[PDB]
Every structure is written in C-alpha cells, then in structure tokens.
Design a protein around this ligand. Structure first.
Ligand SMILES: CC1(C)S[C@H]([C@@H](C=O)NC(=O)Cc2ccccc2)N[C@H]1C(=O)O
Ligand SMILES: [Cl-]
Ligand SMILES: [Zn+2]
Ligand SMILES: [Zn+2]
Ligand SMILES: [Zn+2]
Length: 239
C-alpha cells in the first residue's frame, strides 16, 4: 500500500479492501490498516488475529471503525468463525480507534483498567471490560476469563503509562504493540505520552515475560527478531 510508516507489501501478504493480512503461523495472522495523514502519507498499524479452536481472538482494532469492520469481514470470509473477544493494548487511535465496530458486532472488549480510564481524554471509547495486573506485571486471571492462548502482560510505563503486551501461548510469537520498535529503528516514535525514565526497564521486562518468543510483532514494522526488544531498550537507555 506504500505506507510512509509501517512495513511494505511482500509475497506472503494478502490485500483485502484497504487492509493487508499476513499469516504468521497456522493460527495467527497480522492485520494492517493505514491512516492517511494529509501531506504526510499513510501510517501503517498492525494487530493480530488468533484462531483458538472454534473461535477467533483479536488484538487491537484498526485506526477507524470502518477499517475495523473490514477486519471482521476478512475474518468472516477467510476463517468463518466467531470472534470471542478483543484485547486492545492502550488508549490511542491506532489501537482503539475501532471500538465502536467491535461493540456493534457484539464482541466483548478488554483493555487495561487504566486504558479505560484514559480513553475519554484520548478521544477513545473504553473497552467494556477492564484488565488488572499484579505487581510483577502479569494479568489477574479473574479479569481475563477464557483468554485461551492470549497471555497478557503489563511491562510498566513506556510508550504510554497504560501500554500492555500479549504473548501467544503455543507459538513463538509475542506482541509488543507500540512499546517495541524494530531492530533497525532510528527512533522510539511518538514519545508525547511516554515515560522516558522507565521505558528501558519496561521494554526489557517485556522480553523477560516472554523469554522464548522468537517472533516479535509490533505496531508499525514487520515482525522482527528479539533484536527489536534489545534495540528498543538500548535506545531507551539514552533517554
Ligand atoms: C506511530 C506513532 C508515532 S503515532 C501513534 C499514536 C501515538 O502514540 N498516535 C495515534 O494513534 C493518533 C494519531 C492520529 C493521527 C495521525 C497519527 C497518529 N503511535 C506512535 C508510535 O507507535 O510510536
Ligand atoms: Cl495525545
Ligand atoms: Zn500509542
Ligand atoms: Zn495523549
Ligand atoms: Zn503506535
């Protein structure tokens, strides 16, 4: 789609409307949507789709309701199984812009309690359910019922104070959202809402939470190696 930011199209990718889908594993797909900033071009944002038996789980919306409805259409066409729930990884437009489409479809939505509290101030609609976390960052399991392979971890403040991450159990994939940047990145992206003091520790805590994940998925670059984690932390060390 030639985005100004985000990965470019490659052989594995499937174009569907204005979105791009890439299979990462037999049961995991990356969804990519684009926001056109006037005079600046398209910014890509990635999330995940995970099949868990007879149901589908989603991580992050697209930028908009319409794009998010297109994700649901793609799932309907290509997988033809119901979406059980969606997790959104913090209260910004690239991750929560499409909440209304999820709610219209009857899909149960989950976010960090802090994301839900921040959502009005960030121009977002809150998720219908709040996740809470232990002092070491692991989600309280009572707040994440029937999450299947999704293992939710709060690594500490970084890109935002509310950013969360998700490992996919039964695979070697973990999703760092906007916290993690790729191994070739020259910046940490938008630090406007960031905690620059704690960023490096939070990036490394994500790595330690999922020590055997070899494929690191993130919001604005193609999936990368664990060097994404180490490079992000090294960049954050200089903050
Ligand atoms: C890609 C970014 C630099 S922008 C994005 C986030 C702000 O965090 N911003 C939004 O979601 C709102 C937005 C609206 C219109 C155009 C760009 C961003 N996330 C940043 C990041 O991951 O580093
Ligand atoms: Cl903002
Ligand atoms: Zn953000
Ligand atoms: Zn803000
Ligand atoms: Zn982002």
């Amino acid at each position: 789609i030639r985005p100004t930011i985000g990965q470019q199209m490659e052989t594995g990718d499937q174009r569907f409307g204005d979105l791009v889908f890439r299979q990462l594993a037999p049961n995991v797909w990356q969804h990519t949507s684009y926001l056109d900033v006037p005079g600046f071009g398209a910014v890509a944002s990635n999330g995940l789709i995970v099949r868990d038996g007879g149901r589908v789980l989603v991580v992050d919306t697209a930028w908009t309701d319409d794009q998010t409805a297109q994700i649901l259409n793609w799932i309907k066409q290509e997988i033809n199984l119901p979406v059980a729930l969606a997790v959104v990884t913090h209260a910004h437009q690239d991750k929560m812009g499409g909440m209304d489409a999820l709610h219209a479809a009857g899909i149960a939505t989950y976010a960090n309690a802090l994301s839900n509290q921040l959502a009005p101030q960030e121009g977002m609609v809150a998720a219908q359910h709040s996740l809470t976390f232990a002092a070491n960052g692991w989600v309280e399991p009572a707040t994440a019922p029937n999450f299947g392979p999704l293992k939710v971890f709060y690594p500490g403040p970084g890109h935002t104070s509310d950013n969360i991450t998700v490992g996919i159990d039964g695979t070697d994939i973990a999703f760092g959202g906007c916290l993690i940047k790729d191994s070739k990145a020259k910046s940490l992206g938008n630090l406007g809402d960031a905690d620059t003091e704690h960023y490096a520790a939070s990036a490394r805590a994500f790595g330690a939470a999922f020590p055997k994940a070899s494929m690191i998925v993130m919001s604005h670059s193609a999936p990368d190696s664990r060097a994404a984690i180490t490079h992000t932390a090294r960049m954050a060390d200089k903050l």
